[PDB]
Amino acid sequence: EAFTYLCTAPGCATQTPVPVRLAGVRFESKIVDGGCFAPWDLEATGACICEIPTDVSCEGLGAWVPTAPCARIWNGTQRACTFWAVNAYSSGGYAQLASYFNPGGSYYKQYHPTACEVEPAFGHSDAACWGFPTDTVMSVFALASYVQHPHKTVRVKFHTETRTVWQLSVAGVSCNVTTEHPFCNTPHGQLEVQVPPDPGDLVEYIMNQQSRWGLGSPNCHGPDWASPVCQRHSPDCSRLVGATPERPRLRLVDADDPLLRTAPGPGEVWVTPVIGSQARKCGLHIRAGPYGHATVEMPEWIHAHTTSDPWHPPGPLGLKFKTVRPVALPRALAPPRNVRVTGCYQCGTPALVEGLAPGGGNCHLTVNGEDVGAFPPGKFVTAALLNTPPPYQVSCGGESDRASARVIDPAAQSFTGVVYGTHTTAVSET
Numbered sequence: 001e002a003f004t005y006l007c008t009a010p011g012c013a014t015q016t017p018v019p020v021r022l023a024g025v026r027f028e029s030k031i032v033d034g035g036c037f038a039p040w041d042l043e044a045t046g047a048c049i050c051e052i053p054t055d056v057s058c059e060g061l062g063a064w065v066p067t068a069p070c071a072r073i074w075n076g077t078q079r080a081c082t083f084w085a086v087n088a089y090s091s092g093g094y095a096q097l098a099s100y101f102n103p104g105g106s107y108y109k110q111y112h113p114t115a116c117e118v119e120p121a122f123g124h125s126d127a128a129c130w131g132f133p134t135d136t137v138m139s140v141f142a143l144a145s146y147v148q149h150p151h152k153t154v155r156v157k158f159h160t161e162t163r164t165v166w167q168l169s170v171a172g173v174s175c176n177v178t179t180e181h182p183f184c185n186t187p188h189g190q191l192e193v194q195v196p197p198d199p200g201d202l203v204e205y206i207m208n209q210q211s212r213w214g215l216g217s218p219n220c221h222g223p224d225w226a227s228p229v230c231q232r233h234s235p236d237c238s239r240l241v242g243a244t245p246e247r248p249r250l251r252l253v254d255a256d257d258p259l260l261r262t263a264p265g266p267g268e269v270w271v272t273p274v275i276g277s278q279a280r281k282c283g284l285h286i287r288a289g290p291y292g293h294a295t296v297e298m299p300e301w302i303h304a305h306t307t308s309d310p311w312h313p314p315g316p317l318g319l320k321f322k323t324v325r326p327v328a329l330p331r332a333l334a335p336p337r338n339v340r341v342t343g344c345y346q347c348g349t350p351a352l353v354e355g356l357a358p359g360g361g362n363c364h365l366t367v368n369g370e371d372v373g374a375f376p377p378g379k380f381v382t383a384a385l386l387n388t389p390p391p392y393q394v395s396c397g398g399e400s401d402r403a404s405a406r407v408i409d410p411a412a413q414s415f416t417g418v419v420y421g422t423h424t425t426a427v428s429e430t
């Protein structure tokens with residue numbers, strides 16, 4: 001019997017009693033694909049208008065509201081928009097007098113429909129709108145939503161049941177040691193490798209292709225609080241699920257209002273008319289309180305909060321050299337029969353793998369090359385966490401056979417057991 005320590009850095013090697021070289025460090029895991037993640041980005045636009053527009057929409061307000069921001073914010077999540085009448089028509093017009101601007105603006109909406117809220121704002125300063133010979137007219141439009149920026153969207157895979165893979169070369173023979181499989185064959189004996197514990201769960205941030213690594217769940221209560229994982233979750237990179245901020249709170253705030261001495265809260269948008277340099281024109285100053293009290297800068301966050309490679313303990317590895325040889329057990333090399341795979345892959349819920357193991361010894365069962373355990377001949381049933389999609393090639397170590405599968409992807413699993421969207425009901429007349 002012999003013992004030596006093997007360091008875990010590139011170039012690390014021992015020579016006695018049998019040479020062992022650290023060839024590399026990799027990792028194995030049970031992947032949980034979360035889909036797409038992005039920060040909650042509160043974006044706002046609008047316009048100060050020296051008119052009472054009759055169509056409160058991006059197209060209807062095209063003469064005042066910036067085109068591209070309006071269209072982008074309108075299509076955003078949890079949209080909020082308000083149209084305020086600061087100074088209405090004194091006479092004439094069409095549903096443009098002050099009387100049409102009752103709280104909630106139902107009278108104006110009757111003739112001028114809009115998806116936006118309509119409110120009176122009489123008493124607010126109309127100083128921004130000037131150059132009217134008679135009848136000063138002014139209105140303010142504000143539009144805000146949570147926009148998903150493609151440059152801030154990251155694909156995230158959670159790595160569970162993580163196993164650091166210490167790739168060794170034992171006298172020229174490849175041996176990959178983990179906490180699950182720490183044994184190696186040596187010329188005339190066995191090597192047992194003492195390994196440090198596994199690092200726990202990992203977070204794989206997929207940049208678009210490059211992978212960046214986080215260590216943990218992540219912890220949304222610590223320095224990684226601003227992680228997109230802690231924010232907007234889209235399992236199929238299309239539909240939103242779970243926790244969502246409320247619709248933004250829009251306020252018309254005059255330039256001299258003492259409220260401006262304080263900062264807006266998260267999800268709050270304050271709009272201030274700016275006096276125009278031109279007659280019958282005005283600008284708009286927008287103050288928005290971002291979700292989580294800060295705006296996430298994606299390349300910068302990833303650079304500081306992730307590593308290029310997954311983390312592993314420093315080692316060293318304990319090399320226990322023994323003269324013992326493992327007992328030769330009979331192995332069945334024929335493929336397994338009537339294999340059925342049911343459930344999901346890369347989801348975190350073990351899939352059901354059932355079939356018939358053939359004769360000749362234990363079947364070292366693989367599902368698309370993934371080890372799912374060894375089974376004695378006859379009927380077998382196992383719950384395995386699968387990382388590969390269907391079709392499933394099943395083997396006992398020799399020839400492979402095609403299994404029957406009813407396996408869904410991680411996005412489909414995220415929508416299984418739920419009915420997505422609006423819940424509609426009707427109350428009939430008596």
Ligand SMILES: *[C@@H]1O[C@H](CO)[C@@H](O)[C@H](O)[C@H]1NC(C)=O
Pocket residue numbers: 167174175176
């Ligand atoms: C160890 O891992 C490498 C890379 O995946 C592979 O090429 C090699 O065959 C593995 N060795 C054994 C003994 O499984």
Ligand SMILES: *[C@@H]1O[C@H](CO)[C@H](O)[C@H](O)[C@H]1NC(C)=O
Pocket residue numbers: 424425426427
């Ligand atoms: C919707 O809800 C009302 C009560 O609020 C009735 O129960 C109606 O039958 C519901 N609709 C359906 C299809 O069940």
Ligand code: NA
Pocket residue numbers: 087088089090135136137
């Ligand atoms: Na007026």
